[PDB]
Design a protein around this nucleic acid. Structure first.
Ligand SMILES: Nc1ncnc2c1ncn2[C@H]1C[C@H](O)[C@@H](COP(=O)(O)OP(=O)(O)OP(=O)(O)O)O1
Ligand SMILES: Nc1ncnc2c1ncn2[C@H]1C[C@H](O)[C@@H](COP(=O)(O)OP(=O)(O)OP(=O)(O)O)O1
Ligand SMILES: [Mg+2]
Ligand SMILES: [Mg+2]
Ligand SMILES: [Mg+2]
Ligand SMILES: [Mg+2]
Lengths: 496, 496
RNA sequence: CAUUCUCUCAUAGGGAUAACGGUGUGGCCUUCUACCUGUUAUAAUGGGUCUUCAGUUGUAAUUCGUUGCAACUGACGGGGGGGUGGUGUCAAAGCCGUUUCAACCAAGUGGUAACUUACUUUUACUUGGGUUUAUACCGUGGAAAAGCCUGGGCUUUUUUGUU
RNA sequence: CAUUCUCUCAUAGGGAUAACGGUGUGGCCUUCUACCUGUUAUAAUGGGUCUUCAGUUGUAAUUCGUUGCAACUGACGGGGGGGUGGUGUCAAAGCCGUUUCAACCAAGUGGUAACUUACUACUUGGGUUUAUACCGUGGAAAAGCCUGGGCUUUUUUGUU
DNA sequence: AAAA
DNA sequence: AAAA
């Protein structure tokens, strides 16, 4: 019957997706193990395949078991739903690390219950997304974080003095009152069928306050919870952009922003979600770099991996530190770490001006940021010689960055760190009894690294060119002007 | 070539759609001719197949010719586009009747140019719809008039006294300055590639002011033109809803609505689209039925076939008159009009309490409003006995009507008109020499028509039941609750 | 000037091809209808019944938000013109009847009929999806007849292929 | 406790099952290119070159928005510590060099190392099959334990 | 998920 | 197209 077929399809698709993910995981683990043995030699550890721990907690957690008998599970689920007796099995909750705020309580529901929640979340979103505020970029399938950043950037660039108000909700998911939620079902012209309402209440039955964490239906519940707040902020005339609990409000008038503060306070008192004074920065005044300000002032704001100023959009400083950590660790892992072991048995010592480890490190760096694109391909796309270019790297997560200066500094940092890591590798090789300072990768000065590396050619391709952020940024700008926000983050589903 | 394949696909799809429409048209004409001959007897006119006149104006207008050689057309179009020399051919402009405002000039572009406009409109909308205001419901794949009506109804029901202003632009499409349009291309973070910009300018080259009327790129340009107006209205805090030129702005404060008037005036002065004094009602005050008012007051407002009051949503009076005209003409055509001819040769005369013409008229009426649904099916859906119901009738164009009293009056009108038309048919039959007043369809009183017609059964089905608006309205409400607005009018596209 | 296939100097021009595309009805599969009752060895099949909403009562749960069940009550087919009765008041209005006229707009017009391949125009749609017997459509093929020009061509009917 | 197929009392329980699912590389088709130069009867293949942005100049169209073309100019790889020189000043700051240290965080810490299956969102344009090879389960061999057949560990084969 |  |  209709519901049972839908549940069958959803459960089968979810189980097959999980199985494909596991197979990719173990295949790439084997491949990386082969590469690691080619890297550390005799000191390389053995391949270790981890099945997820909770698969042993219950059979329905296992994708393989669910795929084994999914028709029976779907039949039983449909029968229980039609009898109004269905209740999701309790999830496996683990302490996901949140050192910024202590610890966070995540939950992994069983595959059938997670599939049911996903299906009903899809239905509810489909029939109700026209009622959600257009500034609700939280989750959804029509709104992205990048749309919010574009909106904020354009509006900030329009004027010169803006009043900000950044607020976070302390444990937003875990402190939603159930009375408020049940009162919200008959408001704003929401269309929730009795089956969907019963399912929603079923997912809230175990707890007495707040919505479960880590399941799809909670996303729709969170979006629906902040509808009166969104309407009030809109009718105040302030501009805002909410993403889950993270909210940023900016207006040109102090009175409007004070009223927005009062509105959020009233909404919190109505729904029981208090604001943590720590993460909430309060009311500020976003000016230009050197404009005098009469109240508390800041020259830039941070919003979901972007540091937004009046003039330009730039990568968040913490995200820049993450990028630096990843690149530096790639260099250390492929250049220095193998040489710090007790023995170098089974390792290929660079010779004849052929350091394969340097080539591997450069290729992996290019994969990290470009995604494997050569400079020739990017330049061809920029010139218009070609029309196809795929964007999947660290930059595809920040398509709207227009801060060329920050990317210039990042490129300089990359070159300098490459030079210093090469110097350390040469020193370690000398300490190990190999003089290689006159060979190709080590004899290069910092100034001449980029030029000589670009000139270098292997197998008819330039695999040694040092990747640059500015080039991929130019490609990103052209791709935005020809494809659109959707295409840039098309593969990269902003799940953060 | 990527562009040429896209153009080929679009042109082929458009031509095939037009060919399918034509074949449906002539098959339907033949079937209706057979039925008409079975109705009018020897006085029935002969079948007349009309190919559209403009197909002879140029071969590219003909879907058959385009489908003949579409690869060549697409190749030439792509070559001309990439040479920046492409220019759409002159459309066929005809005087579509607009007696409300005199006449209107619509344009039918050639199939290749129309296909190119549709393709580039799809692209531009896809990469820019996230910048359009959520309150613009015209020419979108995510918005439609019913979302606007739902929003207006909910907001009106929230309060009791609302200040609203209604404005129509005198000639929205034909009086848009091209300087303003070309200035709008670099605003609001719009992503328009140089190719799309060139195409847009190509479609505007023939005229010196205003956008064409009959293409899709004109629809996108109309949406893009009113972006500053939408942003200004949103920043004022007024809640508005725009559908093409028809704009409705309602707020709880007089000052906000006066500022909205000033904003629209400034936008008109900036874009050259002067408002229409006759069509624009100006600033009013929407109260309840008997609440005293201090300024010009109205109890209900009209917006795209809906008459919206504070309490309930009802069909527009002109649309109700259209429904009455259609139903009454169905009755007159199947009952009275054949009997007004000079001779009754070849016409079946009712006998043995079997009026096939009455059955045909009732079935056609049911097709008009229900779409062919029996009362049993609708009652089964309402009870929950069944889960599948299809909504395609006159009611599917007004899914949000919650005025049960108006539908009750319409049902009474239907029954009374059926009774009176049957009486006239009996009188005409008597005048023609046939006494049938004692037979089934005519002996019925007005009170007993519905009951006995429901009891009547032919071929194991109740094809004689008089259709009722209230039942299909209940089905519409349940369908809105279960499936949502998009699915209810999914087949019944109410766009324009 | 095949609406089919193909070629190219490719939004145009050649070639050969007689099918190309589409409709109503029916069969098969696939869901999708509670109950009652016809006919057969228990399944087809035929004839019927009900489904909704609101309130109250009682009842069973509820994680107390809410929900199910049972019984009653109520709602569930317009308006206008004319005649007339009862009720209502001091007299009315009003309310409740009953009779008569009508295709609708028209509860209207200075006036009142027509129309659906219509009308205007924000304005307008037809059966749940595939699978093939018979019916049959647009245009193009051919076979016949006719009526014109020329001495083969044009036009009109019929037939056949698509079928 | 096949992750395969099938049955049902169907979010659980049976049956037989030897394949099931997936990865890297290659081939093939189909696109995503300009230019110069190697080799062959004119096409493959090998090796190189450039592509961007802004301004100015002049030119050609423009439906006056703008666009094209040509030539120049300019931009196009961070920061910190130490030494040192020149410039700058009344003296400085500052600016311009040059030299040296460092894997990154670190322009930092009370202190400086480690780490990627980590910590707290991604890996090559899409299908099509030679060889490589993975998870889990069957098999066949060996071994090491219990029992007198079972358990555990390795090797081989089917997927392949 | 609209032009024409 | 949307989370564990
Ligand atoms: N990566 C994540 N994926 C999904 N949900 C997340 C993630 N991180 C946090 N959440 C949850 C926790 C919150 O309910 C909400 C995001 O809020 P967050 O900014 O983490 O602060 P918080 O609500 O935990 O506040 P506090 O730390 O003060 O309790 O979604
Ligand atoms: N049926 C239609 N199809 C396409 N465009 C239309 C249609 N009707 C109107 N338009 C155009 C005209 C306007 O620019 C806009 C809609 O305007 P509309 O509300 O019909 O009034 P209008 O602006 O034409 O007033 P007027 O009749 O006085 O000229 O789209
Ligand atoms: Mg928070
Ligand atoms: Mg108008
Ligand atoms: Mg009348
Ligand atoms: Mg350091």
């Amino acid at each position: 019957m209709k519901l049972e077929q839908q549940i069958q399809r959803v459960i089968l698709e979810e189980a097959k997706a999980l199985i494909k993910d596991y197979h990719e995981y173990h295949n790439r683990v084997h491949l990386e193990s082969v590469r690691n043995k080619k890297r550390l030699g005799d000191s390389a550890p053995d391949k270790k395949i981890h099945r997820p721990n909770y698969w042993s907690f219950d059979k329905k957690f296992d994708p393989f078991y669910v795929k084994s008998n999914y028709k029976s599970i779907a039949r039983s689920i449909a029968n229980k739903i039609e009898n109004r007796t269905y209740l999701p099995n309790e999830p496996f909750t683990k302490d996901v690390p949140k050192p910024d705020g202590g610890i966070r309580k995540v939950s992994i529901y069983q595959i059938p219950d997670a599939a049911i929640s996903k299906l009903f979340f899809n239905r509810l979103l489909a029939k109700n997304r026209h009622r959600f505020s257009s500034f609700s970029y939280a989750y959804r399938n029509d709104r992205n974080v990048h749309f919010a950043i574009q909106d904020i950037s354009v509006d900030l660039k329009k004027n010169e003095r803006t009043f900000l108000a950044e607020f976070d909700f302390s444990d937003f998911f875990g402190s939603i009152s159930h009375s408020f939620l049940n009162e919200q079902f008959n408001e704003n012209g929401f269309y929730i069928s009795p089956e969907e309402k019963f399912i929603i209440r079923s997912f809230l039955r175990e707890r007495k306050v707040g919505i479960p964490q880590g399941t799809s239906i909670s996303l729709f519940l969170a979006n629906l919870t902040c509808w009166k707040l969104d309407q009030d902020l809109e009718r105040e005339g302030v501009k805002f952009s909410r993403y889950a609990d993270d909210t940023i409000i900016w207006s040109q008038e102090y009175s409007k922003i004070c009223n927005a503060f009062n509105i959020i306070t009233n909404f919190s008192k109505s729904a029981g979600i208090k604001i943590n004074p720590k993460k909430s920065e309060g009311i500020s005044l976003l000016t230009k770099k050197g404009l005098p300000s009469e109240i508390t002032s800041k020259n830039n704001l941070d919003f979901l991996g972007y540091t937004l100023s009046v003039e330009n959009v730039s990568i968040k400083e913490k995200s820049v530190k993450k990028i630096k950590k990843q690149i530096s660790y790639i260099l250390y892992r492929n250049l220095i770490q193998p040489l710090k072991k007790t023995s170098l048995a089974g390792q290929t010592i660079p010779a004849n001006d052929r350091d394969k480890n340097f080539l591997i490190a450069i290729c992996e760096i290019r994969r990290y940021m470009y995604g494997g694109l050569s400079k020739s391909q990017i330049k061809d796309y920029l010139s218009g010689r070609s029309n196809r270019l795929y964007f999947k790297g660290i930059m595809s997560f920040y398509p709207l960055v227009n801060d060329v200066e920050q990317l210039k500094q990042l490129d300089g940092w990359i070159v300098s760190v490459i030079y210093r890591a090469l110097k350390l590798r040469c020193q370690l090789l000398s300490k190990w009894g190999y003089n290689r300072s006159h060979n190709f990768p080590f004899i290069l000065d910092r100034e001449d690294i980029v030029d000589k590396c670009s000139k270098k050619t292997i197998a008819g391709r330039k695999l040694f060119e040092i990747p640059s952020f500015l080039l991929i940024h130019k490609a990103l700008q052209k791709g935005l002007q020809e494809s659109g926000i959707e295409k840039i983050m098309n593969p990269q589903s902003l799940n953060y």
